[PDB]
Amino acid sequence: RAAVFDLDGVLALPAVFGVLGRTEEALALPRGLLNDAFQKGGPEGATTRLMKGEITLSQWIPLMEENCRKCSETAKVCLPKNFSIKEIFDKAISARKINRPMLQAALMLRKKGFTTAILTNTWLDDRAERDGLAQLMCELKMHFDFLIESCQVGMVKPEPQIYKFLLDTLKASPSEVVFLDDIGANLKPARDLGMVTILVQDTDTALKELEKVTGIQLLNTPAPLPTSCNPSDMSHGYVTVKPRVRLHFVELGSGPAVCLCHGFPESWYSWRYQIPALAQAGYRVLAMDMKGYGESSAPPEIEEYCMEVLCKEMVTFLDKLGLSQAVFIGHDWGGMLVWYMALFYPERVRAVASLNTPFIPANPNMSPLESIKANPVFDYQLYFQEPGVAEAELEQNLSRTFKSLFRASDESVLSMHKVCEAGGLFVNSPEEPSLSRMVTEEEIQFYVQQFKKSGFRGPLNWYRNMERNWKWACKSLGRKILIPALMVTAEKDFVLVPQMSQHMEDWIPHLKRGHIEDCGHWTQMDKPTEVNQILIKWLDSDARN
Amino acid sequence: RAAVFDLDGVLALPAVFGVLGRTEEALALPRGLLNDAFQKGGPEGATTRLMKGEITLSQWIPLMEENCRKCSETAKVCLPKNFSIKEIFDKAISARKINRPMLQAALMLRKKGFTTAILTNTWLDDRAERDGLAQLMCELKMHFDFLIESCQVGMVKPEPQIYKFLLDTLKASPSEVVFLDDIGANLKPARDLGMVTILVQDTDTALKELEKVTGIQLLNTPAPLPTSCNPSDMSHGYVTVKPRVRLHFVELGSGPAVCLCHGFPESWYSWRYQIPALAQAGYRVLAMDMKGYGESSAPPEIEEYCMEVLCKEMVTFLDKLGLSQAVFIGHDWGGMLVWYMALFYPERVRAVASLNTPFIPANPNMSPLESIKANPVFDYQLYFQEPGVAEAELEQNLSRTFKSLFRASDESVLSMHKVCEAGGLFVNSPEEPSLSRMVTEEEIQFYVQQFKKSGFRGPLNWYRNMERNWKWACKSLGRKILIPALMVTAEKDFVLVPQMSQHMEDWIPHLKRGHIEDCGHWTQMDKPTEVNQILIKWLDSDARN
Ligand SMILES: O=C(NCc1ccc(Cl)cc1Cl)N1CCC(Oc2ncccn2)CC1
Ligand SMILES: O=C(NCc1ccc(Cl)cc1Cl)N1CCC(Oc2ncccn2)CC1
């Protein structure tokens, strides 16, 4: 049981086939002139040779023209003065856009165990604007197990061989396979080989039919999550910033550089839902394992975690990567870091953005410890301070830990006030915590494996400079942030409440604002789709311009 | 003994200080109006506060205006209708360009054992166009051991503290240090602290003086090599393309993606001289460890090295990296690969380029082995064929191997014809080979270490598919390359002679051509500067447009 989708007319709706007609009307041409001239000679014909990979698209155009001279000639018509097949097809190809709901379906069947595949008759595109084809072929490609292109295999639909071929690459029986296609002709050979066939016109009936024979709802199915990340299928980067300090990250996409700075205690993976989005949106994403986390160096000394050096190391990270600047987006402790970045290295910062984390001026007259007791919900911060105590407690049950922390607003199971008195952090929580809606059991275990490397010393050391940070932070009390910034608040984040940012305007005049209702502190996994909305808008708006 | 250089007026010639005057003339302003208004209040003054990092540049402008209202007022003049300090400084900053010869000098002293450093009074730049500052600060930064900016340390020249500071960061005695600067005032405190001081105006006298007190020629010194690469200071990438196949590479720069495909038997490092250039030129460079080499998977089976799969894996490499297309530049076997890339994946190829390697149509009627005996200098290719024979011989003395192969035109020590009969490849060469001009002993040993990993099986397997490549290659006999391509020939490459490419025009109509006289087969290290010239021109010309 597996499912195969044609490109043109199935997953990519405006059909190149249909734009021909629209040109015929538009151009006052004899109905079918272009379509008939498109396939003159059958399998010996220019088009078939093209589908077989025998000639490039640019090699085909002239070959397509001549058909139209002849085809105009038999019907005894004229082809307009500036009539050009190049232009007609450019617009068309680039007029073709994904069919989000069909794609939706593939993703569901897939997620439901199905082996999926795009089986398309397609040329080798060597136009100048070919990028727009390659660009879309990537969007799609990824959400399928296979892509079979007529031009590489050397076979075209409806040659029964490409079907067997597909069958054998599928490793399935004809009876196990569903096959949707806009071209009846191409259904017949699959049909008569025994597989299911769906004729596609409206996507709605095509899907009704699909859910019917799969026994899996695809039609009007809930709002599906943004595309996530499989650590294996990723690109992983390593840069030494210091002799005993390597930073690790994940690279994806092309465009201006967007640098994602996670929080405590997370990993590059804490961005899984936005990493594909931003790439698609057209940026170059680089998700940090922040110092102390996972596959990045994790030095035991407290002082190697003050902001100054952490930023000193991001700069140096950009040094060794060929980057003048990058846009810094952070969350939790990362959102803080990003603020020092905009504050001490405007040069190197295209634009800054924080998730949850507010810009708080450092009080000259107030040792940040004093400012710790106030606001009672800041008790656990204390509990960390002492090297040893908390590390032990948090490294004791790894799985228990992340399960206990990673929870939606209401799934909470911790009261992070009275923490010190309580004698610990999970003092009054389970050891068997149930699994949140936000994470699968496999997305938890991942975090588990990252920390078996460096433990919690490092991450907890971020909380162990303050006297030092604060002091560094005072120097910048003269300054204002005048680069483009975005502040995004979460409703149900008890620790970092929207109202601490209330005063950020005194400091960042043209601060943009994003809010998110019904959202907790794990803004990335709790509200992936909205996080995406707010950040992509501001990126197009405020980054590259 | 170490050397310190100011930015403005020393390494970056048009001096911001001097453009003020040019504005005064230009604007018919009272000589010195701007300069005096630039430093009103001394150390309490806007400018000093700015140099100290107290305020951002954008915070300074208004503060700089008002000075000019007052300064115009005391001299009793008018400031023009649309008079703006913002615009005046924009142009200026972006009018400032590196001082190549001063830089030259730093690089020499450095290479000569000197500890070097930029000690500049500089602001924190938060303009929109700030990128142009960051961009240049990176060019330079890298070629020095240290950069000390007044705005981070919190100290300005000529405060004697920043000097001591510099001294203590240098870890040197005043007497050990040279210090060039355009501003006499800033020399005095260093001078009177005991270090050498040079007053810079013309760069030529400033350098005469430098070479004088260093005992090292800097003036009119030979044409220096392009900037190379220190593997440690690099960014190293890893992407799995297959279950048991990881590809490794080096990332640097930003812009369109340029993908560098080395040859046999080399490594990403075989591009050391062009990797910094292209980055600077403004592209995103990704130097491959090609399958079988160094830090990339090295599967023993022959067939995992045919072109088809090698390209299938580059595509897949671009998949997992967020790349629609990349420009492929190859050399030796890499130049070949790139040709299949342009031939089977135009979509995915922005532009193609080969170094040495020509585009040879596959003869339908001729088993490529037949076509092997012909052209006698293709004997060693035979010698490889047999899994075992050559691997053994080449893995025997690693160092001997690379020393023996990596040689300029005339440094040759091998006759790669009669190889089979001779009974080996280095049959009649030394074991103690002298070291070529092209490589230091440390650039050899590097190659040595890479191959202790995967050995020679893998690399030699590229030569072990031909019947297979050829067959794959026949399919494309219908096709023409119509994307932008560049073919670069080397004069003294006995194996890949310029004349094999003579016919490439029948295949690639608007093929661009680059030649290089007095050059061998190791085009990258033999002619780094020219390689750079040809490729950067064609990149601006033919890539991004
Ligand atoms: O405690 C954290 N992060 C960990 C954390 C936060 C919230 C929750 Cl629910 C769970 C966890 Cl583990 N921070 C406090 C200190 C940082 O700086 C800051 N700045 C201004 C106001 C408050 N904090 C923000 C991150
Ligand atoms: O032998 C090599 N490279 C290794 C090599 C070349 C030259 C020298 Cl001096 C030393 C070494 Cl080790 N090639 C021959 C096969 C490849 O394809 C090809 N295509 C057309 C004509 C000739 N070759 C080019 C690379």
Q: What angle do CA A464, A466, A472 make, to 5 degrees?
A: 130
Ligand 1 surroundings by CB, under 6 angstroms: A 263-264, 332-333, 336, 357-358, 360, 405, 494-496, 500, 521
Of the partner residues A138, A233, A482, the one whose CB lies closest to the CB of residue B324: A138
Cα–Cα distance for residue pair B328/B349, rounded to 1 Å: 7
Resolution (A): 2.8
SS (H, E, C) B116-177: EEEEECCCCCCCHHHHHHHHHHHHHHCCCCEEEEHHHHCCCCCCHHHHHHHHHHHCCCHHHE
Q: Which residues are near ligand 2 (CB < 6 Å)?
A: B 263-264, 332-333, 336, 357-358, 360, 405, 494-496, 500, 521
For this structure, is A332 an active site residue? Answer: yes
Which of these is catalytic: A332, A379, A493, A526?
A332
Contacting residues of A for B252, CB less than 8 Å apart: 320-322
Q: What is the CA radius of gyration of chain B?
A: 28
CA distance B107 to A526: 52
- Which atom of ligand 2 lies closest to the CA of B380? 1
- The nearest alpha carbon in chain A to B129 belongs to A347
What is the length of chain B? 545
Chain A: residue nearest B323 by CA? A253
* Residue A374 DSSP symbol: S
Question: Is residue A236 classed as helix, strand or coil in its secondary structure?
Answer: strand
What is the rounded CA–CA span in Å between residue A390 and residue A142? 41
Q: B475-510 burial by CB neighbour count: b if 16+ within 10 A, else e? A: bbeebebbbbbbbbbbebbeebbbebbeebeebbee
Q: Is A359 left (phi over 0), alpha (psi -120 to 50) or beta?
A: beta
State the Cα–Cα distance between residues B279 and B227, nearest whole angstrom.
Answer: 11
Closest CA to A367 of A471, A462, A460, A461: A471
**How far is Cα B310 from Cα B340, in angstroms, rounded to an integer?**
10
Identify the CA nearest to A463 among candidates A499, A495, A429, A415. Answer: A495
| Cα gap A73→A67, rounded to integer Å | 10
Cβ proximity of B120 and B6 under 8 Å? yes
A257 token code pair:
């550089």
Q: Is B35 annotated as a binding residue?
A: no
SS3 of B446-498: the string is HHHHHHHHHCCHHHHHHHHCCHHHHHHHHHHHHCCCCCCEEEEEECCCCCCCH
Beta carbons of A320 and A241 less than 8 angstroms apart: yes
Cα-Cα end-to-end distance for chain A: 47
B10 closest CA partner among B1, B21, B20, B18 = B18
Nearest to B54 by CA among B66, B67, B41: B41
**A24 close to A32: Cβ distance less than 8 angstroms:** yes
**What is the C-alpha to C-alpha distance for residues B128 and B131, in angstroms, rounded to an integer?**
8
Distance of CA B371 to the CA centre of its chain: 38
Answer yes or no: are the C-beta atoms of B161 and B155 closer than 8 Å: yes
- For residues B305 and B278, the answer to whether their CB atoms sit within 8 Å is no
Dihedral Cα B6, B8, B10, B15, nearest 10 deg:
-160
Token representation of residue B253: 């720069």
CA distances from A72 to A28, A130, B266 (A): 12, 29, 57
Last residue before each break in chain A (C–N > 2.5 Å):
none
| CA pair distance A110, A106, nearest whole angstrom | 6
Mutating which of B155, B347, B348 best tests the A interface, going by the most A Cβ atoms within 10 A?
B347
Sheet containing A146-149: order of strands: A146-149, A115-120, A2-5, A177-181, A196-199
Task: State how far the alpha carbon of A235 is from the alpha carbons of A266, B9, B99, B133, B323, in Å.
Answer: 19, 43, 38, 30, 12
Question: Cα angle at B134 between B131 and B139, to 5 degrees?
Answer: 125
Half-sphere exposure (Cβ direction) of A208: Cα atoms closer than 13 Å = 4
Taking CA B431 as the corner, what is the angle to CA B428 and CA B436, rounded to the nearest 5 degrees?
A: 95
**Rounded to whole angstroms, how far apart are CA atoms A146 and B400?**
46
Residue A390: name the closest of A422, A368, A357 by CA.
A422
Which residues on adjacent β-strands are paired with residue B31? Answer: none
Query: Which domains does chain B carry?
Result: 1-14+95-215 (3.40.50.1000), 15-94 (1.10.150.240), 234-545 (3.40.50.1820)
Other Cβ atoms less than 10 A from the Cβ of A396: the count is 12
Task: Please state, in angstroms and rounded to a whole number, the distance separating the CA atoms of residues A498 and A516.
Answer: 10
Nearest partner of A305 among A449, A454, A521, judged by Cα: A454
Task: Report d(CA A539, CA A278) in Å as an integer.
Answer: 9
For CA atoms B318, B322, B326, B330, the dihedral sign is negative
Counted residue by residue, chain A has a size of: 545
Q: How far is the CA of A21 from the centre of ligand 1 (A)?
A: 60
Quote the CA–CA distance of A346 and B51 in Å, as a whole number: 15
CA distance B274 to B535: 9
Q: How far apart are CA B538 and CA B545, in angstroms?
A: 10
Task: Report the SS3 class of residue A329.
Answer: strand
Write B365-373 long-range contacts (CB < 8 A, 24+). Answer: B367/B467, B367/B470, B368/B466, B368/B467, B368/B469, B368/B470, B369/B466, B369/B467
CA distances from residue B416 to A504, B383, B404, B421, B495 in whole angstroms, order as listed: 72, 10, 12, 11, 9
- Within 10 Å of residue A542's Cβ, how many Cβ atoms? 19
- Work out whether strand B235-242 and strand B2-5 pair parallel, antiparallel, or are unpaired: unpaired
Question: Before A265, cis peptide (omega within 30)?
Answer: yes
- Note the helical H segments in A57-214: 57-74, 85-95, 100-111, 131-141, 150-153, 160-170, 184-191, 203-214
Residue B540 marked ligand-binding: no
- Count the Cβ atoms, other than its own, within 10 Å of residue A519: 22
CA A234/CA B320 separation, integer angstroms: 6
What b/e sequence results for B226-243 when a residue is b if at least 16 CB atoms lie within 10 Å of its CB, and e otherwise? bbebeeeebbbbbbbbee
Q: Which of A486, A537, A491 is CA-nearest to residue A516?
A: A491
Tell me if A234 and B239 make a contact (CB, 8 A cut-off): yes
CB contact under 8 A, A141 and B49: no
Per-residue CA distances from A177 to A12, A107, A191, A456 (Å): 21, 16, 10, 49
Crossing angle, helix B85-95 and helix B131-141, to 10 degrees? 30
The burial of A483, by beta-carbon neighbours within 10 Å (0-12 exposed, 13-18 middle, 19 or more buried), is given as buried
Sign for the CA dihedral angle at A415, A416, A419, A424 comes to positive
Decide if B285 and A152 are in contact by the 8 Å CB cutoff.
Answer: no
- CA–CA dist B105, A517 (Å, integer): 59
Nearest chain A Cα distance for residue B142, angstroms: 8
User: Strand, helix or coil at A147?
Assistant: strand
The set of residues, in sequence order, having a beta carbon less than 8 Å from that of B102 and lying 6+ positions away, is B5, B10, B11, B203, B206, B207
- The answer to whether residues B401 and B394 touch, using CB atoms and an 8 Å cutoff, is yes
Q: Are B265 and B293 in contact (CB under 8 A)?
A: yes
Residues 6+ away with beta carbon under 8 Å from B266: B293, B331, B332, B447
CB-CB neighbours of A437 under 10 Å: 10
Nearest-atom index, ligand 2, CA of B381? 1
Q: Which long-range contacts (CB under 8 A, 24 or more apart) does A191-195 make?
A: A193/A160, A193/A163, A193/A164, A193/A167, A195/A167
- Which residues sit opposite A352 in a β-bridge? A328, A485
Q: Which among B501, B486, B484 has a CA at the least distance from the CA of B349?
A: B484
**A173, B12, B138, B526 from B107: Cα distances, Å:** 68, 15, 15, 21
> Cβ contact (<8 Å) for B320 and A59?
no
CB within 8 Å of A489: residues ≥ 6 apart: A356, A498, A501, A513, A514, A515, A516
Distance, in Å, from the CA atom of B339 to the CA atom of B329, rounded to the nearest integer, reads 9
